Amino acid sequence: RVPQFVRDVVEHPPFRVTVNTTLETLAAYLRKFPVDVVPVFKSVFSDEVAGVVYPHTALLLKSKKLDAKVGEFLNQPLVVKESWRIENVAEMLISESKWGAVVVDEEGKFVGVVSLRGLLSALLLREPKAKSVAAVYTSIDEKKPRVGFVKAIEKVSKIFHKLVGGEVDGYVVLNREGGAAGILTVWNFLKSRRWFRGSGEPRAIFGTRVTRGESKPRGVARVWRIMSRGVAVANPDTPITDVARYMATFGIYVVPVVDRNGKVIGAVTAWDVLHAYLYGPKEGREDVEV
Amino acid sequence: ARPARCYRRIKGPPYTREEYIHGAPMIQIPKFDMGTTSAAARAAFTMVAKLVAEERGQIRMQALEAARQISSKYLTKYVGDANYYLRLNVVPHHVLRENRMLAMAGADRLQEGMRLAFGSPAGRAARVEPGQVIFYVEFKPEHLAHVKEALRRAASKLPIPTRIVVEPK
RNA sequence: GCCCCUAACCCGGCCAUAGGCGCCGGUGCUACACCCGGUCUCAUCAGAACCCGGAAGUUAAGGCCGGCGCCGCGCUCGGGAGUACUGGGCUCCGCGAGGGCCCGGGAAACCGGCGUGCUGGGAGGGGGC
RNA sequence: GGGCAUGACAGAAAAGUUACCCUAGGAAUAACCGGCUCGUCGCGGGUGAGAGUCCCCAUCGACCCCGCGGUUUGGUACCCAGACGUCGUCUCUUCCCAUCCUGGCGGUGCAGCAGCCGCCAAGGGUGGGGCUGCCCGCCCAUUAAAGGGGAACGUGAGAUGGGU
RNA sequence: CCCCUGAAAAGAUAUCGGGGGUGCCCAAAGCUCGGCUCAGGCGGGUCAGAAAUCCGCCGUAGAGUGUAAGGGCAAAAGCCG
RNA sequence: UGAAUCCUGGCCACUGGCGGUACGUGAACCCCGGGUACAACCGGGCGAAGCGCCGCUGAAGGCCGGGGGCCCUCUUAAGGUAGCCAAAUGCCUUGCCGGGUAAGUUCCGGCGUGCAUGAAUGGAUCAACGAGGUCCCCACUGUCCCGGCCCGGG
RNA sequence: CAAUCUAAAAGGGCGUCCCCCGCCCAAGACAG
RNA sequence: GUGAAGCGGGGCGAAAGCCCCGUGGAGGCCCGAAGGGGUUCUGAUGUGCAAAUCGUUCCCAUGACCUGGGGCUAGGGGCAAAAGACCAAUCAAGCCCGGUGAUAGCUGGUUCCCCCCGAAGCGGGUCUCAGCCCGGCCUCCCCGGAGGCGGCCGGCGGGGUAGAGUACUGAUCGGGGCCCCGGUCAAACUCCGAACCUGCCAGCGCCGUAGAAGGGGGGAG
Ligand SMILES: [Mg+2]
Ligand SMILES: [Mg+2]
Ligand SMILES: [Mg+2]
Ligand SMILES: [Mg+2]
Ligand SMILES: [Mg+2]
Ligand SMILES: [Mg+2]
Ligand SMILES: [Mg+2]
Ligand SMILES: [Mg+2]
Ligand SMILES: [Mg+2]
Ligand SMILES: [Mg+2]
Ligand SMILES: [Mg+2]
Ligand SMILES: [Mg+2]
Ligand SMILES: [Mg+2]
Ligand SMILES: [Mg+2]
Ligand SMILES: [Mg+2]
Ligand SMILES: [Mg+2]
Ligand SMILES: [Mg+2]
Ligand SMILES: [Mg+2]
Ligand SMILES: [Mg+2]
Ligand SMILES: [Mg+2]
Ligand SMILES: [Mg+2]
Ligand SMILES: [Mg+2]
Ligand SMILES: [Mg+2]
Ligand SMILES: [Mg+2]
Ligand SMILES: [Mg+2]
Ligand SMILES: [Mg+2]
Ligand SMILES: [Mg+2]
Ligand SMILES: [Mg+2]
Ligand SMILES: [Mg+2]
Ligand SMILES: [Mg+2]
Ligand SMILES: [Mg+2]
Ligand SMILES: [Mg+2]
Ligand SMILES: [Mg+2]
Ligand SMILES: [Mg+2]
Ligand SMILES: [Mg+2]
Ligand SMILES: [Mg+2]
Ligand SMILES: [Mg+2]
Ligand SMILES: [Mg+2]
Ligand SMILES: [Mg+2]
Ligand SMILES: [Mg+2]
Ligand SMILES: [Mg+2]
Ligand SMILES: [Mg+2]
Ligand SMILES: [Mg+2]
Ligand SMILES: [Mg+2]
Ligand SMILES: [Mg+2]
Ligand SMILES: [Mg+2]
Ligand SMILES: [Mg+2]
Ligand SMILES: [Mg+2]
């Protein structure tokens, strides 16, 4: 009984988010139960969907003293049907580079959401076209891949916008020698707030002696202070199914790839894994023995 | 979704080349021709009603879909699917944009206000001209009152004034 | 030598009215060909091609000419149409996006009709100086 | 004449921090109020799938669409940097109506007791406490009811000074 | 710095406008001469196959031309020597 | 660091300090060669501290997470022990359950994968002391309900 | 009696003035 | 006021010891004047009595206590039970005089009359964006010497926009048998294609020997 249709992978988040949920509450929810896409309902007593938000939306918080609700940052959802096949929905996720979609039935009633985790798990019960990481892996020399490479001592302000904006799905963090120090994704920013510092527009300083009317960020956290340490690395001959199992289980969509000396030469993204399960090796690549 | 008045007027060039547009939304209209579509059976129908636009403007995809549902349901109930042909005549080619702060939509979308103002896709609309046919019906003269009622219901869902023109084929 | 007239051949201009498909005819002294050979110049896996030497055979094919049909194409022709659009003016209309009036210009698709290479130089042939 | 380089690419050799801060200025430029705008916010209307035993419209109102207000938030940067005292509360006055009660009327899926819905109507009323710096909100005992807004987010040359 | 669009049929033309690219690479991917014709399709042909080499027909470029985009190119600007 | 009392865990990767046989590197002087009738100049040799390298050091500045099967393993070393907690430290959050009030966003007592607690960076800890910050109870009252009259000076 | 300048939409109305079309009445039409 | 060590008596008791009363006079001990300090009312005052005061309520008050006179430490220096306090009403580095009329792309001011002409906020470069330079635009003078062009008509050219189209590249709804027919579209599509703008020549019109074109020089804003 291999899942083939969307109805076999539709998932229901453990928590309910409405338009009045604050970004701080949303971050607390995702700390406990990580999900790839959050449907937002118009109210507590209505199953109508006002839109969706992503884990990245919780990172739009500017200050803990400034009001910010989920309803102010709603994305347009990607909508799929429960009757569609798993491979077809995977194609739409690759096209838009989106981590999930809203599932509706034939009449448009909200059924649930489908995520990258769910599709990866469903394809786990199949046989990849390409079997080695070497066949599908993003090189460190590519111009604008969906994975970043950053030094461990960099400031998080340098890479923050690329993560929250979704231009990459994660970062491989390099030590001084070019080895894999760790992994940085939005989940690192959701688990911990060691990176966070409140900001805001200038205060209404009138009729008083106050010498610093605007908050300024001075000590900026370094990447290795909040990264995931000790992630397993992959080799070109690593099986693609071990990578897929990791990504499906933990929802981390970047895995570093190292040469024999441990130096990072690229990464495997969740989009690379889907490519192996759907088509096979990339153009000009060959599947090495596993 | 914003109120439809925000995208009613034609304020710029058509935005349709989907090979240059990242994340252009998919069309959410399942069918455009309803009833009896085969050309042989349409020869029985001898009357034509048209819901004609009175102004130029942009009709959003969801309004076209809402108009299509109410009219087709009414005709199915009162006229019968074998006794009419209904066609939604315009296609929502134009892509709508919105300038809102969002996550998971690009780094430039994180800058507030009118800095980097070019919007991300927000929907689709059909750009129509005065006199343009929005809905097209073929029917038998015995059902004239029902066809006019179906098109009156369709018009109540549309952002621009329209008028119903009835002529023989 | 010179002037005039004039098929197919040679060198051209414009580059489909010249192209494409099908059918029916015409042309052969000469000219163009198909054609006959490979010692020589030259040529290749291959005298098929290219190149050389020829003149038995043939208008079956090519070339050129005439006719018909369809497709394609062309037109300073009729309609489409003074329509669409537009330069200038307006205390003219409309809630508004926009429209209207006056002076001056003015399409396209399409439908119908007509057309289906024209022409410059030379050789050859004819007539005269 | 060729090369060795300035990528901030018509070419300095160059890290922070100031809430202990200072000077010159800027409404060429932010924060409060005001102006413009109204996406957002609040309020109204069209439509009628569907619910309502039957029955669209007693009560609702999916999918969509037309609006009003300036009451939340934003957008913009027009005025004000030789300066318009920055939240709330107290005190005191007035205005709006999109009416919570009180006056009038109608509908009801109005038997009565109650309830729900609409219309006219702003003369009067709309209070006392617990919690929090609050505003807002939740709650307690009452009550005819314990409406909401505007006035330089009314009012610090009137106070208070808990927060910022 | 470069291409297309914006750009309003001479020229010029901006925005933290839109879609992309550049800090190279190649002793050939540079020069020239000759020959040839590409993608794709069909018919026949021993392994042989959707796809190898061979014979034939069609094929306006649907290929190729290092590299973005736009432009150009068929007895060539492509392919082979 | 901060009386006393019970205690004070694991980590030397990093930033420092210190110790060290050999080796690499490491300035001037000096030595050798070339060059120059002499010099300038060019090459080599020798080579101190230091640095590289190897060790020690946390009551040095400090740090104390994952994955896997008590064991292995990854990342800049280790992997938060005894304790303590919605803390003057918890965003979510007026956290949940009790106390106290008619009603308690504060307070007290518990709970704890604790956004981001923890051991001389001191942990736990309140006897005595306090113009320290806070909650509750009794008494008390013009603080108030809700204002009135009087006295001295303006 | 344009604009700056203080306004108004979808929708409803034979309220009223008017224009056009279809059908009935050839005095056996519409209303009782 | 409390009452440490030490020292008496009495009581219970088997020993040790325990209990009561007294004596004694310790302590950065307690209450509280003087004295010292400076918490509250966020009281009065706030052009003050005062460039820091007054009332009230408070904290310490045998000690790391308060206080007179004399002495030492001096500015990149002192002194600090540490607040970057204090060092003569001056301190994240004193005061005096000197360098010194520091510099300021920034702000303020810049004084009589008439007459002639009369701008600009554009392009390029700049550690350039409140500055400046080279051009455009103004003015004045001189050289030069006959042509010039914000308009129109014509001849001969250029163009690819509006519209149109859906034929190349793409998008898109239906019907019929990969083709045919109908329909919806295109800033980064184009067979076609205006109005319109623009090049040369000729004419018209106007300007020009009271000086066209062109050139040089001064001053700009
Ligand atoms: Mg400041
Ligand atoms: Mg516009
Ligand atoms: Mg430059
Ligand atoms: Mg004000
Ligand atoms: Mg403002
Ligand atoms: Mg709204
Ligand atoms: Mg209704
Ligand atoms: Mg506002
Ligand atoms: Mg301004
Ligand atoms: Mg003003
Ligand atoms: Mg002023
Ligand atoms: Mg004032
Ligand atoms: Mg003032
Ligand atoms: Mg009213
Ligand atoms: Mg106010
Ligand atoms: Mg005041
Ligand atoms: Mg005042
Ligand atoms: Mg305060
Ligand atoms: Mg405070
Ligand atoms: Mg141009
Ligand atoms: Mg090139
Ligand atoms: Mg060639
Ligand atoms: Mg320790
Ligand atoms: Mg523990
Ligand atoms: Mg404690
Ligand atoms: Mg805790
Ligand atoms: Mg507390
Ligand atoms: Mg810790
Ligand atoms: Mg500590
Ligand atoms: Mg610590
Ligand atoms: Mg401690
Ligand atoms: Mg004390
Ligand atoms: Mg309107
Ligand atoms: Mg004492
Ligand atoms: Mg005070
Ligand atoms: Mg006072
Ligand atoms: Mg006074
Ligand atoms: Mg005392
Ligand atoms: Mg300080
Ligand atoms: Mg000094
Ligand atoms: Mg100094
Ligand atoms: Mg001086
Ligand atoms: Mg003048
Ligand atoms: Mg200025
Ligand atoms: Mg002309
Ligand atoms: Mg057009
Ligand atoms: Mg069109
Ligand atoms: Mg032009």
UniProtKB/Swiss-Prot annotation, chain B:
One of its GO terms (cellular component) is ribonucleoprotein complex. The keyword rRNA-binding does not apply. Belongs to the universal ribosomal protein uL16 family. Keywords: Ribonucleoprotein, Ribosomal protein. InterPro entries: Ribosomal_uL16, Ribosomal_uL16_arc, Ribosomal_uL16_CS_euk_arc, Ribosomal_uL16_dom, Ribosomal_uL16_euk_arch, Ribosomal_uL16_sf. This is Large ribosomal subunit protein uL16. It comes from Pyrobaculum calidifontis (strain DSM 21063 / JCM 11548 / VA1). It comes from the Archaea. Coiled coil: none annotated. Pfam families: Ribosomal_L16. NCBIfam families: PRK04199.1-1, PRK04199.1-4. GO terms for biological process: translation. GO terms for molecular function: structural constituent of ribosome.
